[PDB]
Write a protein that binds this ligand. Sequence first.
Ligand SMILES: Nc1ccn([C@@H]2O[C@H](COP(=O)(O)OP(=O)(O)OP(=O)(O)O)[C@@H](O)[C@H]2O)c(=O)n1
Ligand SMILES: Nc1ccn([C@@H]2O[C@H](COP(=O)(O)OP(=O)(O)OP(=O)(O)O)[C@@H](O)[C@H]2O)c(=O)n1
Ligand SMILES: [Zn+2]
Ligand SMILES: [Zn+2]
Lengths: 310, 310, 310, 310, 153, 153
Amino acid sequence: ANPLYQKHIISINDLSRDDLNLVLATAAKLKANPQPELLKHKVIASCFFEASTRTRLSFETSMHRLGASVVGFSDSANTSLGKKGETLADTISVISTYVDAIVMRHPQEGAARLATEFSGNVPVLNAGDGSNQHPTQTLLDLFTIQETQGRLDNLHVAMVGDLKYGRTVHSLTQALAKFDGNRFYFIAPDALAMPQYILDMLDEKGIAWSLHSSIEEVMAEVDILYMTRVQKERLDPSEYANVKAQFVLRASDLHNAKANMKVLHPLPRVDEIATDVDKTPHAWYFQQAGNGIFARQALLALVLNRDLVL
Amino acid sequence: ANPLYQKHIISINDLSRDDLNLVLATAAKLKANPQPELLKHKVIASCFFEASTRTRLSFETSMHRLGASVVGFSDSANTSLGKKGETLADTISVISTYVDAIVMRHPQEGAARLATEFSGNVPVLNAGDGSNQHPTQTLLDLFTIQETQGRLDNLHVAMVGDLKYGRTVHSLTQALAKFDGNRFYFIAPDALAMPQYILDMLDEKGIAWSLHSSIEEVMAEVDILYMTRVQKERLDPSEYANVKAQFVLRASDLHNAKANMKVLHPLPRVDEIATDVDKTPHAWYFQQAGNGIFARQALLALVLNRDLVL
Amino acid sequence: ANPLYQKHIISINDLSRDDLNLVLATAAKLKANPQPELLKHKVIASCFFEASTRTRLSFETSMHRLGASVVGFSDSANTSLGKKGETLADTISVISTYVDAIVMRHPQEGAARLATEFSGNVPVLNAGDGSNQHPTQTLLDLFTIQETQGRLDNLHVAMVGDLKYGRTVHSLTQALAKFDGNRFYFIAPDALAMPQYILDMLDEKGIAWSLHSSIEEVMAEVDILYMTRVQKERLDPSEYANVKAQFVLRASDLHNAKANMKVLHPLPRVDEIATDVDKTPHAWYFQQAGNGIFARQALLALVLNRDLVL
Amino acid sequence: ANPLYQKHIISINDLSRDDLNLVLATAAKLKANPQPELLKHKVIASCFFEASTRTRLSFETSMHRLGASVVGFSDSANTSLGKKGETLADTISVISTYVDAIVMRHPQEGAARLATEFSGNVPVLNAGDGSNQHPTQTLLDLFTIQETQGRLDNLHVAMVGDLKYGRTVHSLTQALAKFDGNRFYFIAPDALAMPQYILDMLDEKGIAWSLHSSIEEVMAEVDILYMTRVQKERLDPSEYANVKAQFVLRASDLHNAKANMKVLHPLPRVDEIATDVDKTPHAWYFQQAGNGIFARQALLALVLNRDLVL
Amino acid sequence: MTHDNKLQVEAIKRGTVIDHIPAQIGFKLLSLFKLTETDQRITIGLNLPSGEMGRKDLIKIENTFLSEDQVDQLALYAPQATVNRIDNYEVVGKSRPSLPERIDNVLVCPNSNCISHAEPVSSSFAVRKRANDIALKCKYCEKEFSHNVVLAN
Amino acid sequence: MTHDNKLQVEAIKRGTVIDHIPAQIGFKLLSLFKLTETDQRITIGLNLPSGEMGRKDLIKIENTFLSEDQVDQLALYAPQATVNRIDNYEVVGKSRPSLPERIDNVLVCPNSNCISHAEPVSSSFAVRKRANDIALKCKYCEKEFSHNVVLAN
Ligand SMILES: Nc1ccn([C@@H]2O[C@H](COP(=O)(O)OP(=O)(O)OP(=O)(O)O)[C@@H](O)[C@H]2O)c(=O)n1
Ligand SMILES: Nc1ccn([C@@H]2O[C@H](COP(=O)(O)OP(=O)(O)OP(=O)(O)O)[C@@H](O)[C@H]2O)c(=O)n1
Ligand SMILES: [Zn+2]
Ligand SMILES: [Zn+2]
């Protein structure tokens, strides 16, 4: 039976290097020969207690591409749950009484791991829990670095944007720190800097990093430039505007990019990457989102299948 | 490969007579022998940025009757998209990264044709764009005129109701003007008259039409009586009431109808067609809605299939 | 007592030429020599069941410049009275035991006239009742026309915009038609034209009216230009934007107007009057809104005080 | 006339040391020997386009203790003016024909300064405009500092909390920097620290400031401790809860404070000041909120009355 | 030389000379058609004397030949403009603008509900001379308007 | 009338010549300071060869004399320009721009929450600290930004 069989994918900190490679090699195989009936007769719950369309449509398409049925809800705007004080332990004790895996997003951190204490043997896969984890976004980003760069080690990865509160850059720095010789360049407004617990883990593992203030200082050496959105309310209107709105990428800036460099953005991008970047070979944000299908498919294939045929 | 293969069905003005016949003969075949696995393994997105239940349940049942999977959202009341300024070019560049056709309704006119510039090769089929087009409503109406009348040319078609803002009567007059010898009778309150660009196209094609003030002036000669709803806010409460609420059909009025005459209404009907009309042989509004399934099925079969088996 | 003492002020239809001149006479008196303790110890109720803050502040400032007390409310999506179940008739029956006069604006027509049968000896003054009446707007419009032109007879008044649904333009035409020799020009989009009843009344009185298509064709002969706001809901966006080279006024258009020509507008003036008009001498909408204070002081003074010797 | 007679009160930046002392001088006079008929017959407008009931009740009570009339509104999700389409400039242009003074609080910065160009000879007094200014809060803070300490020069003032976004702490530092020899201690979380512009201004004036990490290290030397509320949205829950052993004040912390040390807070004080402080002699936030009455009486009295002999 | 006209001004070796621009269209066209985004010498004349045609404007742009499509665009604006190319010190071709079939980019849809307004889209209108006017049909809306309504804006 | 030519065109009688405009600022200045809404003959030369910048722009507006504060409004765009005022073919005056104290109308407050965006008021900024690099403070929201930032959006 494969290692991931019937596991809960709750946190990146819980997956080993080995675990991460396995998911990535299965994604590569399913992207190459489809397996449209692998999860035939499985029913999977898509519980989005917090609405997230991008993530939901992606997760359910990939459940659909392996042959599974989907039942579920998207809420934030009412869909009767927690109705009349019903706890989340209780909702999950009732949903696991009839679906074969629960995919869930929830506003509070810790909610997917609590689901785990009540779901019996139905695997729980986390699609986001407040400001804590989002594994399936890190799996798709990793898959995309690997497929475009050929490797996951010895990379020069720049992380540009709001690094203090960008929940995805924090997990991608932890995943990449599992591999060797990567070098990190953080480029953030002072108010939005990469927190200490990250930096402290990088130092302790002997991994190199450095802060720069503009992308021009580092463009030439860079393989993956991962942009994040600054949310305008983490700053006031005039802080955003005043001199910090210059963590914006444009085509002109890409001149000296290595031929292999790729630009990644978990999306919505709104300001930070100008529309003229789209026409360049380095724009890989949309192809990154399409890889969400294979990464996500691979996790559901590995978790529901004892043995995998390939 | 069939002409419609992998086309975007955005506007009626873009479909030829030939194109319209083809869709209608395929609807007739699928209504006669079902093809429940024709779109097996296709996943289709049902994006209703504006909610429309009638249209959505119809479109998804017909995707289900050809074997396809559906992922999608209905919004107007929040489902997290346009979240944080995300443009529609960007949402479509991400949805076409994983579904095989996009069906979409949107509040603004032009939105399905914009989707087309960003969807790559995934066909976009328009389920309504503001006050502009709704092809799939005109295809189902046409199918219903054809199946009940035996032809689409040489008809006497009366259009009764709010003709100024009824987006469906405007497209059905353009589609029917593709065919020969049809005669139009418009019966509208003065405030709700058939706009000039319509009349001007009919004149220029040498097609006959005329305005009448009551259905009794024309009942005897009529084959298709297409009723539209007046929306009470296009008029004030007392304008509606005062003498213009007499574009209402009742059983009594049908006395002298030809035996073949049919009453069509895209629905909700609320006032305009009295409940006693339902028991008559001429009431075809509900059977018109059921034909939405075959018209809609035919378009998805023609657009996703290179060659069709029949 | 004065003729209006203790009278109800509900429709412009109900005030004779003479009552209209009495009000206007008084209001010039109060403007000139103010009497701030005239309604000392009176308590007026400002029942706005429909919010209109401009009208509410004008009235409450009128109440306080005559030294009266004010209790009341407004109700955009809020506060209890009329409830749903609790009738307007019972609301009024209870409030007319507490106050000395009731100013009310309600969304349904005739609400003020219903009120009159429940307020006892307490006078009720209409501030707007659905699309029916708003007499205190007509009273300030005539006061501004009389104060700029010197008379209310023999005027060339142009009325422009939504003549079909501006309640103010319907009223101002009835009131100006009690005075003699007035000539009316109605420049409106033919979908939004003056109702046949205003016109049929005007021809029974022998009054002269003509309809025009753009202000530029009467600019030369006109005394009062009464712009109205075109209500874009009663229109299609494309319809709204289609009309000629519009019916909005700009200073360039004014280069032919007589020196005593004044542009009036009940406000808001989103679009139809450009800012450059504000600096010409013909602009008088803001001054018109200040005369709202003296017109409503006048009405309250005559209704609540037995005879007036100012 | 007095120097502030008919002046607009918009930014603390615009009032000289002398104007600040005049206001404070007057307010002690009105507190001592009240003059309840000073603005008899004046009508002030309380335009709160943004609700703040504490500030609104303080001002309207100031208006009524001087015998003035009040018309106006508040607008948490409600009442018509400013509309969307109707400009602030046209709202003010119309209201300044009705009243004698306008107090206004608006959510966008500079709204009060825009107003000033449209109110004619009518004075406008700012009650808050986005994150820019709130001069009547600074005026009562200085009145409380002058009334407890005896002077406004040579003070050791500690400012604590969200120094980056408290508009009140930015203002109070400008105003105290017009008086001489003041020494400032700023105890803030380094993510929420005093902007470089307050500090660069303070060094151009030669003023002494130092930054500290917890109140306990300056408790001993301090005269005024000005607590601010830490705004938990501009923070992560875990960040919010992480800081030291906090920057909240409790009586235990006060056991070293000088006898004349007073704790001030603009209010609300959810968390940062514990209830046991309320009973110590150093607590002065409630008394500070009562001085709000005498500071705003003073401003209104000097702006609307030509010279004052109390 | 003199009855003024030339007094020393710009004869060019090769380029385009747009002449008889109607007065005030002259600056529209530079903006709209983004003619200054070049390094080549441009010499422009505004409110140029034209006893010959009232008053006019004239842009001279060298070593650049603005053709076919680019010329027909200008017709909505300066419909009586004669473009002239030059390749060695004299007129090698005079070209009047004819109305095109499509006008891309420079024009806004009057329709405020049209999706062209909020999106990364280049505007595009189909042109139709309906005697008395040119109607312009938007490619997104499919709403048709008088060219006077669209150019007014 | 004097022997013009296009590498440095010649003589207008009476009026203003703004010379030594950096490349590509000339059109910017025409559109921004609305110089073109006059009936006077303007002559403009773009990307010309000259006095050492190599390549420059130049604007000639006959009969208009724009001065002292008008010239100063040109300062963060063309600080090294010269505004010659001409009368009867003689350069009777040579000004250069200096930093103004107020720059009305032309700029846009980068602060998305100030009220100036939405209304019939024109922008106004107080200017601070010459050439080591300028600060502009909005009249309305009293927020101070770096000129580099106001000069993008
Ligand atoms: N070496 C040259 C040759 C011609 N031109 C310009 O090319 C234009 C072409 O006009 P032309 O055919 O030479 O005589 P016109 O009668 O002025 O043309 P039109 O019939 O339009 O008046 C003139 O404005 C002239 O300035 C030029 O700048 N340089
Ligand atoms: N009647 C005149 C006289 C001069 N000029 C213009 O005036 C400008 C410069 O004035 P001038 O002092 O005469 O030449 P320079 O000494 O080179 O001026 P500078 O050194 O400041 O460039 C030149 O571009 C010239 O075209 C003009 O157009 N019309
Ligand atoms: Zn359009
Ligand atoms: Zn600003």
